[PDB]
Each structure stands twice: as C-alpha cells, then as structure tokens.
Amino acid sequence: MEHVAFGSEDIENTLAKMDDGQLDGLAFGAIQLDGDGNILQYNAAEGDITGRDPKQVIGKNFFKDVAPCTDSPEFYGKFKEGVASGNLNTMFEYTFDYQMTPTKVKVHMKKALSGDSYWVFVKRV
Ligand SMILES: *C(=O)/C=C/c1ccc(O)cc1
Numbered sequence: 001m002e003h004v005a006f007g008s009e010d011i012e013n014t015l016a017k018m019d020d021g022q023l024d025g026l027a028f029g030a031i032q033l034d035g036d037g038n039i040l041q042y043n044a045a046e047g048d049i050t051g052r053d054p055k056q057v058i059g060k061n062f063f064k065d066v067a068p069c070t071d072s073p074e075f076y077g078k079f080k081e082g083v084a085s086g087n088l089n090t091m092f093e094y095t096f097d098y099q100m101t102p103t104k105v106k107v108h109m110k111k112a113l114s115g116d117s118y119w120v121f122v123k124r125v
Contacts, residue, residue, distance in 0.1 A: 001025050006123050007091065007108055016113045024054075029105075029122035032112065035083045037063040037076070046122055051100055062120070069098045079109055079118065087111060088118055093125055 002025035004014050015023070015030065020041060023030050029046030033039060038061050042054040052066065060066050063076045070076055075094060082088025088111040096103045108121040 001027060006106070006121060011108075011121070012110055012113050012119065015119065020054075027123075031062065031120040031122070033062055033079075033118045033120060035116045035118070037061050037079070039066065040117065049103065049105065049122060049124060050096060067096070067098060069096060070094070075107070079120075082109065082111060083118060 002018075002022055004011060004026060006028040008014070015026075020043070023041055024044040026043055026045055029049050030041070030043045031039060031046055032041035039058050042052070042057050044054060046052070047054045057066050063071045063079075074092070078090050078092075079088070082090065088109055090110075091106065091108045094105055094107050096105060104125050105122045106125045108119075110119045110121070111117075112119055
C-alpha cells in the first residue's frame with residue numbers, strides 16, 4: 001500500500017502529482033476533478049467501492065455523467081462554491097445510489113496543490 005490516511009491534514013501535499021499507479025495504492029478512494037467536475041484521476045479503491053472502471057470514467061463529468069446523485073447542493077453545490085472561491089476543504093457523509101446498491105460513504109473534498117484540480121476522497125462508513 002501507500003502509507004496515507006484518509007483525512008490527513010496535509011493529504012494534498014502527499015498526493016500531489018502522484019501518478020495513477022501510486023494512487024492505486026491508497027487505502028481509500030481518490031478522484032481528481034478539474035474545476036468543471038471532469039474526472040482527471042480515479043483510483044482502484046474507488047472503483048472497488050462504486051463499481052466504476054477507473055480507466056473508463058476518466059474524462060467524463062462527475063456531476064453530469066457519472067454521479068448524478070451528487071448533483072445537489074450538499075455535494076456539487078459545496079464543490080462548485082469551493083472551486084469558485086479557490087478554497088475547498090469539506091468532509092461529510094453521503095449515500096451513493098445511482099445504478100448501484102446504496103452505499104454510505106464519508107467524502108473529503110479538498111483543493112489540490114496544483115492549479116485547476118480538486119480531490120474527492122471517499123471511504124466506506
Ligand atoms: C451517485 O450518483 C453517486 C455516484 C458515484 C459516486 C462516486 C463514484 O466514484 C462513482 C459514482
């Protein structure tokens with residue numbers, strides 16, 4: 001594995017510029033989105049939680065295409081407010097339920113260190 005804990009205070013420094021292969025070594029799901037919600041990175045742990053194939057979802061829009069159940073004030077709303085402000089660091093539980101067995105997760109969205117990039121970290125609860 002890669003030795004990084006969900007919710008660590010400096011997680012954006014540790015994961016910075018991690019390539020796809022190292023991201024697959026994390027204990028929790030990790031998605032990287034651009035400012036519009038398009039998927040830039042998506043690791044194996046997340047695919048194990050949600051059933052999505054990490055290589056097929058890259059390039060899709062998370063909120064419009066892959067995860068409509070997050071198209072809501074409580075998830076996408078928080079994401080888009082953080083993007084617009086250039087600051088994002090929010091943790092909350094949520095239920096993923098689009099075309100899947102409803103799965104309760106803890107979500108941590110945090111602005112990446114690099115440019116037009118935002119992390120969505122996920123673990124089961
Ligand atoms: C609800 O539509 C959520 C769907 C979803 C969440 C997270 C993923 O990695 C994939 C699909």
